[PDB]
Structure formats: structure tokens, C-alpha cells
């Protein structure tokens, strides 16, 4: 079986009984060239082990700077033929989400200039790892390189890998089940993708988790219904029609102000009624270009 990764600028592109081989279309530092077709790469390797190795290699595959389509492939391969982690995968994710924290903490307890040797302080073996809506009461314990992450009811899973923060692909073994997960940094916690699923995991101690609940669930409003022009410039190109729809963050128009290109971006999942501008017209601050 062979995976045909498709694109549907590249900041990072770090491709990976199984023997695989990749055929690379574009290398790192390339662009999305409107001339040719959309295509990125090909990756090739019994039916069962084959599909499993394809899954794990897919997960290993790292792409950043654009909106690639690998999640779709991973999901539609997951089916027997975005969700939230569940029974088999949620625990496997929580384990890693705790081990990463433990590693960062062991390295962060070596800061210089302390007042009394930190060895006398004793770690806390209880922790509450919180996924995007779930909750798990983990008890971590250092016994060798591998850790022993005991759950509540009694299920244990010794995490064991050699991932150093910065490397955008965690890869190791949890409960003798080889695993490749993609991590991204966040504000307080990490961003994980293992199967088709994705999650934003945070990890707290008991009291802090007892505290966080008090905080209210902040809400997100909307913008207006016009694409206001925030730069006193000279319009260069409107690259959309009147009757199309646009998803959040997509380029709509492009102007020139200080002889440097500036691109506009929509903000709501709504179709576009009537342009309030035109090619080459001059705009000062607060000038309507679109009417959502």
C-alpha cells in the first residue's frame, strides 16, 4: 500500500517489520506554486501490519506553514472501512501529556542561584491531567528512564521515549505499543495529535485544578459585516468574486502602501454580497471594501 500525501510557504517538512521509502515532491522552504498541480509526496512500505505501519508513518509525517490534508487521510483510514479522544486513545494521550510535563519540570528544577539545595524538596506524586473537556487523575512515578504513570482504577503504562523538546514529533513506546504523536507548543499545556483526533492537554496539581474551575468560560463575539481597510493605501488586486464564500483566515484582497504588499483576511464564514471598492482605487483609514 502507498500513501499519496497531497496539499489540499513550507516552514517545516520532516518526513520519516517495516521498511518505508518516501518520494519527495518539494523540499523544505518551498512555496505553493499556483502553476502546477497540488501534490506533495509519496510514501510507500501482510494486510494488517501494512495498514498499521501506514498509520504510524502517516502520524510521523510533519508539515507546517500551510493547511495540509493529512488529518483527512488519517481519519478516513481510522474508520473500519475532528473527533475527541476516546477509551483506547485518550489514556494513551494522557500518559504522554504527563510525561512531557514531568521532563520539563525535572529540567526546570535545576535553575541556578537558589538559596538552599533543592534536593530536600519532595515532588508531588498526584496530578490531574485535563484534556479539552475530560479529566484524569494520574499518579506519576520515576523508576528508571521509563516512568510508571498509574491511573485511578489501576491501569499502568510505562512511557519510554527519547524526545527532546523542540523536535516536533514525539516517538516512543507506551505499554509496549509503539506510538508516534505530533506536539505543538501552546500557552500553558501542549497541542497533541495522535490518531485522527486532536487535543489541547493541560496538566495541573490537585489544588490548582480545584482552583481553575472557578474561572468562567470566556466567550468569543463576532466582527462587523464589512471588511474595513486598516491601511491608507492603493488597492492592487481583488482576488474573489461576488457570490463566493470564504473560510476563516483566507486572503481576499491585496494592496500596496509603502511599496510593500499587504494582504487582507476575512473573518466570518459567510458569502460575500457586493464589493464596496474596485481595482486601483485609493483608500484612507476606515473605508469599506466588502459587505458581508
Amino acid at each position: 500500500v502507498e500513501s499519496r500525501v497531497y496539499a489540499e510557504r513550507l516552514t517545516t517538512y520532516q518526513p520519516p517489520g517495516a521498511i518505508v521509502r518516501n518520494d519527495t515532491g518539494v523540499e523544505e522552504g518551498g512555496e505553493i506554486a499556483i502553476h502546477y498541480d497540488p501534490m506533495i509526496a509519496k510514501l510507500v512500505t501482510t494486510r494488517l501490519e501494512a495498514i498499521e505501519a501506514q498509520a504510524t508513518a502517516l502520524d510521523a509525517f510533519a508539515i507546517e506553514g500551510i493547511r495540509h490534508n493529512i488529518p483527512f487521510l488519517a481519519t478516513l483510514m481510522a474508520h473500519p472501512r475532528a473527533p475527541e479522544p476516546e477509551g483506547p486513545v485518550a489514556h494513551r494521550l494522557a500518559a504522554v501529556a504527563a510525561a512531557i510535563d514531568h521532563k520539563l519540570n525535572i529540567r526546570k528544577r535545576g535553575i541556578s542561584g537558589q538559596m538552599r539545595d533543592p534536593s530536600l524538596l519532595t515532588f508531588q506524586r498526584e496530578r490531574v491531567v485535563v484534556l479539552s473537556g475530560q479529566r484524569f487523575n494520574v499518579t506519576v512515578d520515576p523508576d528508571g528512564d521509563d516512568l510508571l504513570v498509574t491511573f485511578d482504577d489501576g491501569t499502568t503504562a510505562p512511557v519510554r521515549s527519547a524526545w527532546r523538546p523542540g523536535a516536533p514529533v514525539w516517538s516512543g513506546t507506551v505499554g509496549d505499543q509503539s506510538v508516534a504523536i505530533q506536539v505543538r507548543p501552546l500557552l500553558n499545556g501542549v497541542f497533541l495529535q495522535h490518531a485522527g483526533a486532536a487535543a489541547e492537554a493541560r496538566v495541573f496539581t490537585r489544588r490548582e485544578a480545584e482552583l481553575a474551575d472557578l474561572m468562567p468560560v470566556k466567550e468569543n463575539a463576532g466582527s462587523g459585516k464589512q471588511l474595513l481597510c486598516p491601511m491608507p493605501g492603493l488597492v492592487k488586486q481583488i482576488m474573489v468574486s461576488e457570490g463566493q464564500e470564504v473560510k476563516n483566515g483566507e486572503p481576499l484582497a491585496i494592496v500596496e502602501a509603502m511599496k510593500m504588499e499587504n494582504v487582507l483576511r476575512a473573518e466570518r464564514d459567510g458569502t460575500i454580497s457586493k464589493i464596496a471598492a474596485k481595482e486601483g482605487d485609493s483608500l484612507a483609514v476606515d473605508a469599506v471594501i466588502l459587505e458581508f
Partner: protein, 506 residues
């Protein structure tokens, strides 16, 4: 004696159960919860739990609540000592009586004596009217101490609720102000006086809310979604900062390799001279693990400033940002960079600068706003500093701007340049128009002269031939060079004359 335990349990209750419930309902934590969450487990030592106010006018003598509305003490964060005080909204609205100020001054004085940081958490309700002129005295003392410590120990402030009246002047004199997004605001005068004087009707949030102060006024250095986020991020930040102006920056063992190359950088700069790129990507590609703590992220985005780590040491980064307003220097960006550089120099943190600047912002509005002095501020900041300075000229440096931004002549130690650099007195078209003015009639000839000037003079090599550039480097090696350079630069020691203080253009 159990009586002391009883008294303690009654003091830890602030101003009543019901006011605490009202506090939790607005989404805010209480003073003691904040203290408990910031510090390491079990390290908090409290001072002056039982102080009381001493006024007897206007019926105040009938309600004496212990603690006078502020909680103060000291503890440890990551093993290093810190002092902190937190104002208590549930006790007379957190106002400032005489005894209140006595506690604050005691804690500030002691912190300056032991040379340790100070964290202030504000949730107050202004001046206590009943104490008349007495209250004012309190204010005064606090101010003095702040100024005495400025530049000796780092001071961090966190605004977590209303802060109105004269009180607002205390945080203003600290090194960093952080704010909570939807439940804080700062102003000198409140809406009612604004109405009575100017007939303008404005709500508190629109007058002084977090957005206004993080995007327009320059006061605040950042916002956060809620209290927990703010406190955890303050704890994270504290690990970057030195403890005082004597000891160096703290150092931790790094997980990264100091000799790695990154081929991708060879394509970052676009070939078309009018297409922009994001400097932030480069900055996050040069720090240890892609971690970068941004300062004043939402204000004056034509310049980027922040703290990162190289080889386990904190380093400050300043960079021009092409994505917004073509990266020109204006008044706001100049002020932001000047104050940040002054902080970095005061505590002996090395500085890295990435330069891509075509000039200053033209127009009548900038001149009527006093752009001259604002742009002079940054030059002053760079030129007086005595710490290592390393600069990288990625694509452009035209005119006088090329001097303010840490040029060899104003005291930078090492100046590298990528091959795409263009160092010149002004753009090709303007220069040729000025030099060959007597023929501004012709068209083909002017184009010919422009081509000749552009190929001869708009490159890094004339600058190198004059010795203003130490080395022209291939892009993909940039990180390595920095990591090596800073090493040799650790010993920079130089002497200057004796002055009371500089006379920076305010």
C-alpha cells in the same frame, strides 16, 4: 493556645463569607488564593496579620477589621526568594489607609535591603475619603520607595481589577505591567467627573479597559484570559529575569545543540523586492527551542521585542517587522524599543538586533507629534549601553535609520550581513534624481543611470570595502555564529566618566 488558632481562622476570612461569594461570582479569585497559586507549596511566610486602622472620625471607629485590606509576605518561586503583596477588595474596597501604607512600605524596604524581586497584585478601590489628608501621606511614602528600587531589583505588577485614582501612579513606575482582559481597568479620573466636565458619556471599559491600554496608550505589556493564566505566565517569566543588578542572568542546562545548521533560511527572503516576510519566524528559529516571551505584543507591531534563550542564557531580541507599515520607524515603535533596551542594559542582559528598515515615517501628523525626540530616544538607548550587542542586517538599511539601529559606529561589537543586504544613503531612484538633476527631462537616460547606480552601489560590498561590516555570512549559519560570538563577548568591561545620571530626552 487554641485562642491564637481561632484568631488566625478569623483573620483568614477577610471581610465576611458573603463578600467572598460575591467575589467568586464575578469570576475573580481572592487575595489569598492568588498568593497560594503563585508561590511554591508551603513557602509562604506572612507578615503583620493583625494590623488595624486608627481613624476615629465619621463613625469609622465601630468597624475594625484585621489586616486593613492588604496581604503581604515573602516566599520562594523555583527556590529563589521573592516578596509580594496583594490588595484585598473585600475589606473597605482595598483602599489605602495609614496602616495599609505602613505594611506596604515595610515590605518594600525589606525587599530592597535583601536585593530580591517584588510582585504587586492590584485589586483596589481608590482613596479612603474618611481618613482625610492622612491618607495622602500614605501614598507619598510608597512612591518614594518605588523610585529608590527602580533599576536595582526587578518589579512586576499585575492589575486584576479596578484601579482608580492616585493609586494608579504606583504601578506606572514599575518595569512591567500586565492586565487581565475583561475585568480590569486603569484611569486617573472616573466616568462621573468626565461627564460633569466634558459632557461626554463613556463607560468604564471603553474609557480604560484592557484593549484600550494594550493597543493604544502604551501602558500595558500584555493581556491574559483569566487570573490563572496571568499568574502561571508570571511564574514562567520570573525564570528569565536576573535577581538583581549584580549577579548575571540565571542559566539552565539546555536540550539543544549549539552547532546545528538550518538550510531553510536560504529561502526566507523573497526575490521580489516588494514582497514581505515574517521576521518572527526567524526569531523563533534562532532561540533554543522555539520559545519566545513577547513583550508589548499588541502595540506598535512594526517592531518585535522579547526574551529568549541561547545556550541556556537569557538574551533579548529586537527586530524590525516588514509585515506591517513596511517596517518604518515611527514614534510608538521607537518608544517601545527604547524602554525595552534600557531595561535590558540595566540588568546586564545581552542584545541581538535584526535590521530591515527603509526609513522613517513621513507625514505632517508625525512631525506635529514630535517624532524628532521620540526617534532620538532609541538612539540614546543603544548608544549608552555597555553590554554585548550583535546585529544582523537581513535586507535593508537606508539613510539615517541605518545609524539608530545599532550600527558599528554607535557601539555595536559585531555586525554581520546576509548576502541580500542593501546599505545605501537612499534608494536608487531618489539618489539618481538628485545627482543627475540637470537631465530630469529624458527618460531612457535616467533609466540607464538608475540601472548603473543600482548595480554598483546597492549591495553589501561597498560597506564591507570600507570596513563597516565585519563579515558577510551565509544565512544558514546564522544561529551558530551568534552562539559562538556571545561567548567571547561575556567579558566586556569598559570605563566611562562620572555623572550623577544621564539626561535622556524625555
Amino acid at each position: 493556645l487554641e485562642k491564637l488558632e481561632e484568631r488566625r481562622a478569623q483573620a483568614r476570612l477577610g471581610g465576611g463569607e458573603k463578600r467572598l461569594e460575591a467575589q467568586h461570582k464575578r469570576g475573580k479569585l481572592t487575595a489569598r488564593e492568588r498568593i497560594e497559586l503563585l508561590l511554591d507549596h508551603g513557602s509562604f511566610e506572612e507578615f503583620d496579620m493583625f494590623v488595624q486602622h486608627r481613624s476615629t472620625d465619621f463613625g469609622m471607629e465601630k468597624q475594625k477589621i484585621p489586616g486593613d485590606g492588604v496581604v503581604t509576605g515573602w516566599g520562594t518561586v523555583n527556590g529563589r526568594t521573592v516578596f509580594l503583596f496583594s490588595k484585598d477588595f473585600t475589606v473597605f474596597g482595598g483602599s489605602l489607609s495609614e496602616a495599609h501604607a505602613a505594611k506596604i512600605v515595610k515590605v518594600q524596604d525589606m525587599a530592597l535591603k535583601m536585593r530580591a524581586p517584588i510582585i504587586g497584585i492590584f485589586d483596589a478601590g481608590g482613596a479612603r475619603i474618611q481618613e482625610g489628608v492622612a491618607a495622602l501621606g500614605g501614598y507619598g511614602e510608597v512612591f518614594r520607595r518605588n523610585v529608590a528600587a527602580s533599576g536595582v531589583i526587578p518589579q512586576i505588577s499585575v492589575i486584576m481589577g479596578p484601579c482608580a485614582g492616585g493609586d494608579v501612579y504606583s504601578p506606572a513606575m514599575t518595569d512591567f505591567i500586565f492586565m487581565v482582559r475583561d475585568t480590569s481597568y486603569m484611569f486617573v479620573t472616573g466616568p462621573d467627573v468626565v461627564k460633569t466636565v466634558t459632557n461626554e458619556v463613556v463607560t468604564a471599559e471603553e474609557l480604560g479597559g484592557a484593549k484600550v491600554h494594550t493597543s493604544k496608550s502604551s501602558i500595558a505589556d500584555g493581556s491574559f484570559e483569566n487570573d490563572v493564566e496571568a499568574i502561571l505566565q508570571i511564574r514562567r517569566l520570573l525564570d528569565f529575569l536576573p535577581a538583581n543588578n549584580i549577579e548575571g542572568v540565571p542559566e539552565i542546562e539546555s536540550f539543544d545543540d549549539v552547532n546545528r545548521l538550518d538550510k531553510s533560511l536560504d529561502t526566507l527572503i523573497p526575490d521580489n523586492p516588494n514582497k514581505p516576510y515574517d521576521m518572527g519566524e526567524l526569531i523563533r528559529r534562532v532561540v533554543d527551542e522555539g520559545d519566545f516571551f513577547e513583550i508589548q505584543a499588541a502595540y506598535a507591531r512594526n517592531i518585535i521585542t522579547g526574551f529568549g534563550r541561547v545556550e541556556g542564557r537569557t538574551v533579548g531580541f529586537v527586530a524590525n517587522q516588514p509585515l506591517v507599515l513596511a517596517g518604518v520607524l515611527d514614534s510608538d515603535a521607537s518608544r517601545k524599543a527604547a524602554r525595552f533596551v534600557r531595561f535590558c542594559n540595566a540588568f546586564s542582559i545581552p542584545i541581538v538586533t535584526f535590521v530591515d528598515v527603509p526609513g522613517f515615517l513621513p507625514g505632517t501628523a508625525q512631525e506635529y507629534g514630535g517624532l524628532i525626540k521620540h526617534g532620538a530616544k532609541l538612539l540614546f538607548a543603544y548608544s549608552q549601553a555597555t553590554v554585548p550587542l550583535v546585529t544582523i542586517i537581513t535586507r535593508k538599511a537606508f539613510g539615517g535609520a541605518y545609524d539608530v539601529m545599532a550600527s558599528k559606529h554607535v557601539g555595536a561589537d559585531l555586525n554581520y550581513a546576509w548576502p541580500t543586504a542593501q546599505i545605501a544613503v537612499m534608494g536608487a531612484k531618489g539618489a539618481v534624481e538628485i545627482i543627475f538633476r540637470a537631465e530630469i527631462g529624458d527618460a531612457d537616460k535616467i533609466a540607464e543611470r538608475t540601472k548603473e547606480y543600482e548595480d554598483r552601489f546597492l549591495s553589501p560590498f561597498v560597506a564591507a570595502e570600507r570596513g563597516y561590516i565585519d563579515e558577510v555570512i551565509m544565512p544558514h549559519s546564522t544561529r551558530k555564529r551568534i552562539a559562538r560570538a556571545l561567548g567571547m563577548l561575556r567579558t566586556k568591561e569598559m570605563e566611562q566618566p562620572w555623572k550623577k545620571h544621564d539626561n535622556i530626552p524625555l
